[PDB]
Design a protein around this nucleic acid. Structure first.
Ligand SMILES: [Mg+2]
Ligand SMILES: [Mg+2]
Ligand SMILES: [Mg+2]
Ligand SMILES: [Mg+2]
Ligand SMILES: [Mg+2]
Ligand SMILES: [Mg+2]
Ligand SMILES: [Mg+2]
Lengths: 23, 218, 129, 208, 83, 83, 129, 98, 71
RNA sequence: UCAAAGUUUGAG
RNA sequence: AGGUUCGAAGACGAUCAGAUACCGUCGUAGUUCCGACCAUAAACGAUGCCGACCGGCGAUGCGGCGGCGUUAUUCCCAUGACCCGCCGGGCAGCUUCCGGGAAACCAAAGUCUUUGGGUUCCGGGGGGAGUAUGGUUGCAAAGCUGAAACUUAAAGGAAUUGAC
């Protein structure tokens, strides 16, 4: 889809936020 | 032999109308392909611009068929742009040539600046446009020639437009369209109301009035 | 808003002339408009217009005559420098044979050729043919 | 028209029109027609300036006269009102008629059989007798028309403000045109009235 | 259509044009020398009064105003005749 | 159309709408020359000559030909002042 | 639920009658054999069929006219009863009925004949939405 | 491409309208959109009407009616044949059926 | 619309100056990146050393091997 | 006055 | 603060090859009010704002003017509801060879190679990607700003004939 691809990205960012907050 | 199916045709056959400028004045529709060929027999010359094959999908493959573009002109004043879409190419072509001959139109060709000699360029900068394509003809000074793309060059020569700067935009690639546009340009030379015209029109009888007692053939 | 009076005056007189109107009204009027028209009237493009003195701003009614391909304007009123005036008239007028760029000079509002005679530069207004 | 002295009006003709009710037009005035009207009434009917009506009628007459070989004045009704009237007209005049069901491309088409190539049409209702009126522009045809208030004057080059509705007034308007061409050339004096009846031009509702 | 004397418009169709768009922007309104029945004094109202017009004798009220023209009180005759 | 030698050039001179100074082109088929007859004056009865107006297509399909012709008529004394 | 005739029947039959109304008749077998004489038919069945539709058309003709056909005697009758004239209607005896607006028209056109005026009708309400 | 100028939804000059839950699907829908079928109807319907009027206590009696403004969502209309699809011409012609 | 006025130059100019960086080619010339990214540091050719010969399998519709060199 | 019905040589 | 209904999540019952879904039975948060954040929507007419000009028609909504009749109240007055126009300004509608447009269409999407009324925001093949990174705002969720390397010959719109 597109909506769901956007969701994907926003979750996937949400991980990258969380990994970089470890440092 | 020719047998005129029209009123005008019968007049022309009987050597009643002297030139096709007597027709163009009164803006009569020429429907006989022989009229034009009688007035501009020879001189008038034809060239196939392109054969494009256009094809409609049927349930059992496709009806591939042809479309021959033809321009025609007597390298002096007159040109036409014939398009006929038929099955076998020859039969397409043949019809297009006729369709051009029926189309043909006069060009008012003019001068660039210093008014001397015999007209050579387009009078005023006109355009003809067609389905995204837009063609501008511009008056250009003697010698220049036609500074133009091939397809416009081809007609513009055939018209009797010796010299002309042109520009163009849209999808000039679409040949038929691009010829159609540049044709409608030089058709619109005689449509532009310069001050050179301006003198109140006289009005003449018209062939159908002038030859009234003739047409009712005694 | 109403910004370039001249501009909306010309435009209406051309929009008339397209649609075939015999005469045509124009709703602000000005020295500049008037002056322009007079130049067009000099060269046969329009008829004998006439102007309604409201105790205010103005109103012209121009007798048209179907002779006018297009009366147009150039904003901005660019300064032409005679040098350039040839270039202007080349890429703005439809020929070297008719048309008149009309530019406002020291001398007055006038076609390019009255300007070229007098050898006067000027600011452009508009054009017609 | 030049309703200056000779071919003016006369009390007897106005009495005709009034009776036939050609003046009593329609409710829906088209802006082209505004020109040919005295007034709306109460109710909702635009009454047609009849002097005005005549003036065009005579013009049309003068236009039809101009056609040298009258044959190629081609006359049409589509409606079963003009139907007979326009046949009668062409007979007395010497024009050509087409009563109903105009065959698309009689004015266009070389090939086709009914290819008539006239110099002037006369239609009844430009609304209805319409196909021909559009054809009268692929081939260069001036035109006459019996227009009401309702009518559009698209392509009609010389309108006539009528009651193209009413069968009575239609025949009357065709009969009137018939006189006036005939007067403007040959077999009518003008001092004596015309031997033909207007009633000969009327459409008959199945009566007897 | 295609021909309209914009310099010679008839008053039968200027009356029916907007005060502003009439060739010479006129007003639509008028002053009217009202009488009233009681007083002999002659008050002078304006069609569009927007004020409760009280007399010179100050006996009774003339013009209760509204949207457009003013409502004249009961037995109050008037005349425009001027200008 | 002329060149500097003064000699007429250009292969024909277009007809030109009597309603719009506009040129009835090589293939403006909508156009018309209406010939219209005269009279002697004293008799009615068509006397030889014509009043002959021509109108460009445009104005026909604008539906403004009939108004045009009407107006030309009364410019040549054919139509006798509807008022 | 089957037999419709083709145009090769219906044309022939239409034309035949146009040319031999006289000799043709309602009695089938007579005009079955007429159609053999006057028309050169190739087959028997088609002959026989044509004749059928002929007898179907002879039945219609005996009961007003038909659209796609021309009998000589019908056309003569139609011609007679489309040049009918009684002693005239559009004189509207003495007294034509008329409005004030028409009477005002006729005053403006210089007329005051023998026509009677009548209105009451207040601006009603024409149609309804 | 734009299918209808309208956009099958008679709004024009608003921005928002109360939504209506469809009497069939339950589906949410704009009120202005959504095919609305009012129904008036005799309670009894034409067979049993004479059964009843024979076994009435009341001499004569008028018999009442049953007034229902069903709203339909597009699907639900289209499905239960409350509304067909139409040709490009026909689509434009907004007269009710006779 | 345009800015069009007379004392606009700057606004006009600066606008086009901005919009040049949505022209893919312009950006290639005027951002660094491309110049950095080429192994031929903006050079028409470059010498190198062939550190193996490499089998390049061609793009789908035209099936073949291409024979390349890891320089 | 709405049960279930997924997929389709790389071999031109 | 409150919690009727419905109802993310979650539980069952079905259905299916499987259904962690569609159908059904429960049901948390949420839906509700107040006070504080958040700044996004197909937030759409997918159509920037002001200004002019360029054809009809019927409608409707407010205000105003003008008009003969009805209803009426009580016997007239003054009415309000009707009725028939005109004026301004709205919401739209139909209408056509105005003119445009790749067009479907648009009286604007017109007045454009006959190109300039004023001015703001903006796009520059498709992807990568509204991603990475820096800044900033936010309690969070996220928002605003916003690349490149690399890839790739189309991706796209409109309309046609088919097939389905
Ligand atoms: Mg919204
Ligand atoms: Mg559930
Ligand atoms: Mg919430
Ligand atoms: Mg957004
Ligand atoms: Mg645009
Ligand atoms: Mg531009
Ligand atoms: Mg891109």
């Amino acid at each position: 889809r597109a909506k769901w691809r956007k969701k994907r990205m926003r979750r996937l960012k949400r991980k990258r936020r969380k990994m970089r907050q470890r440092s | 032999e020719w047998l005129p199916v029209t009123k005008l045709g019968r007049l022309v056959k009987d050597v009643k109308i002297k030139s096709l400028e007597e027709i163009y004045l009164f803006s009569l529709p020429i429907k006989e392909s022989e009229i034009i060929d009688f007035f501009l027999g020879a001189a008038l010359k034809d060239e196939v611009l392109k054969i494009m094959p256009v094809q409609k999908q049927t349930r059992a493959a496709q009806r591939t068929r042809f479309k021959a573009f033809v321009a025609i002109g007597d390298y002096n004043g007159h040109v036409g742009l014939g398009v006929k879409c038929s099955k076998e190419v020859a039969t397409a072509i043949r019809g297009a040539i006729i369709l051009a001959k029926l189309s043909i139109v006069p060009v008012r060709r003019g001068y660039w600046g210093n008014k001397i000699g015999k007209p050579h360029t387009v009078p005023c900068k006109v355009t003809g446009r067609c389905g995204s394509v837009l063609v501008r003809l511009i008056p250009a000074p003697r010698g220049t020639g036609i500074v133009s793309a091939p397809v416009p060059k081809k007609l513009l020569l055939m018209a009797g437009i010796d010299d002309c700067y042109t520009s163009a935009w849209g999808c000039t690639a679409t040949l038929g369209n691009f010829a159609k546009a540049t044709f409608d340009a030089i058709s619109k030379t005689y449509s532009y109301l310069t001050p050179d015209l301006w003198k109140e029109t006289v009005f003449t009888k018209s062939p159908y009035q002038e030859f009234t007692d003739h047409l009712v053939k005694t | 808003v109403r910004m370039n009076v001249l501009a909306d005056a010309l435009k209406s007189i051309n929009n008339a002339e397209k649609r075939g109107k015999r005469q045509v009204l124009i709703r602000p009027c000005s020295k500049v408009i008037v002056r322009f028209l007079t130049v067009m009237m000099k060269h046969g493009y329009i008829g004998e217009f006439e102007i309604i003195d409201d105790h205010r701003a103005g109103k012209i009614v121009v007798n048209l005559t179907g002779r006018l391909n297009k009366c147009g304007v150039i904003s901005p009123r660019f300064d032409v420098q005679l040098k350039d005036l040839e270039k202007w008239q080349n890429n703005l007028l439809p020929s070297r044979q008719f048309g008149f760029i009309v530019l406002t000079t020291s001398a007055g509002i006038m076609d390019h050729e009255e300007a070229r005679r007098k050898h006067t530069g000027g600011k452009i207004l508009g054009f017609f043919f | 028209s030049g309703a200056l002295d000779v071919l003016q009006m006369k009390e007897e003709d106005v009495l005709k029109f009034l009776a036939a009710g050609t003046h009593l037009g329609g409710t829906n005035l088209d802006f082209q027609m505004e020109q040919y009207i005295y007034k709306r009434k109460s109710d909702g009917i635009y009454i047609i300036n009849l002097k005005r009506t005549w003036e065009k009628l005579l013009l049309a007459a003068r236009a039809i006269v101009a056609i040298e070989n009258p044959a190629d004045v081609s006359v049409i009704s589509s409606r079963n009102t003009g139907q007979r009237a326009v046949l009668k007209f062409a007979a007395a005049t010497g024009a050509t008629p087409i009563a109903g069901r105009f065959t698309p491309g009689t004015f266009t088409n070389q090939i086709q059989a009914a290819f008539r190539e006239p110099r002037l049409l006369v239609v009844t209702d430009p609304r209805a007798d319409h196909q021909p009126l559009t054809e009268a522009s692929y081939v260069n045809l001036p035109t006459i028309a019996l227009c009401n208030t309702d009518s559009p004057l698209r392509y009609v080059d010389i309108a006539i403000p009528c009651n193209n509705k009413g069968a009575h007034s239609v025949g009357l308007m065709w009969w009137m045109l018939a006189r006036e061409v005939l007067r403007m050339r040959g077999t009518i004096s003008r001092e004596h009235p015309w031997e033909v009846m207007p009633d000969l031009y009327f459409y008959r509702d199945p009566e007897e | 259509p295609l021909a309209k004397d914009l310099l010679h418009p008839s008053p039968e169709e200027e009356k029916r044009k907007h005060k502003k768009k009439r060739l010479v922007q006129s007003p639509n309104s008028y002053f009217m020398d009202v009488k009233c029945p009681g007083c002999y004094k002659i008050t002078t109202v304006f069609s569009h009064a927007q004020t409760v017009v009280l007399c010179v004798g100050c006996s009774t009220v003339l013009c209760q105003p509204t949207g457009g023209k003013a409502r004249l009180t009961e037995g109050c005759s008037f005349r425009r005749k001027q200008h | 159309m002329q060149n500097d030698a003064g000699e007429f050039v250009d292969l024909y001179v277009p007809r030109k709408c009597s309603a719009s100074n506009r040129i009835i082109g090589a293939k403006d088929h909508a156009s018309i020359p209406m010939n219209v007859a005269e009279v002697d004056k004293v008799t009615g009865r068509f006397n030889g000559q014509f009043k002959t107006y021509a109108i460009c297509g445009a104005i026909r399909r604008m539906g403004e030909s009939d108004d045009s012709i009407l107006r030309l008529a009364k410019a040549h004394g054919i139509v006798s002042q509807n008022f | 639920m089957g037999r419709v005739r083709t145009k090769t029947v219906k044309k022939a039959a239409r034309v035949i009658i146009e040319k031999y109304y006289t000799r043709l008749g309602n009695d089938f077998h007579t005009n079955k054999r007429v159609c053999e004489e006057i028309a050169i038919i190739p087959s028997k069945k088609l002959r026989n069929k044509i004749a059928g539709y002929v007898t179907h058309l002879m039945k219609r003709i005996q009961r007003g006219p038909v659209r796609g056909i021309s009998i000589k005697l019908q056309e003569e009758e139609r011609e007679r009863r489309d040049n009918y004239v009684p002693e005239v209607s559009a004189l509207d005896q003495e007294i034509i009925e008329v409005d004030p607006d028409t009477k005002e028209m006729l005053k403006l056109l210089d007329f005051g004949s023998l026509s009677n005026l009548q209105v009451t009708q207040p601006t009603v309400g024409m149609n309804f939405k | 491409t734009k299918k209808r100028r309208n956009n099958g939804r008679a709004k024009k000059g608003r921005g928002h309208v109360q939504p209506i839950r469809c009497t069939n699907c339950a589906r949410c829908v704009p009120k202005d959109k959504a095919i609305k079928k009012f129904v008036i109807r005799n309670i009894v319907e034409a067979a049993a009407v004479r059964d009843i009027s024979e076994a009435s206590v009341f001499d004569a009696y008028v018999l009442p009616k049953l007034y229902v403004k069903l709203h339909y969502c597009v699907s639900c209309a289209i499905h239960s044949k409350v509304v067909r699809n139409r040709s490009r011409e026909a689509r434009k012609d907004r007269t009710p059926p006779p | 619309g345009k800015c069009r006025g007379l004392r606009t130059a700057r606004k006009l100019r600066s606008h086009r100056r901005d919009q040049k960086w949505h022209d893919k080619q312009y950006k290639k010339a005027h951002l660094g990146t491309a110049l950095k990214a080429n192994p031929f540091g903006g050079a028409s050719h470059a010498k190198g050393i062939v550190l193996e010969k490499v089998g390049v399998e061609a793009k789908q519709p035209n099936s073949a091997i291409r024979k390349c060199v890891r320089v």
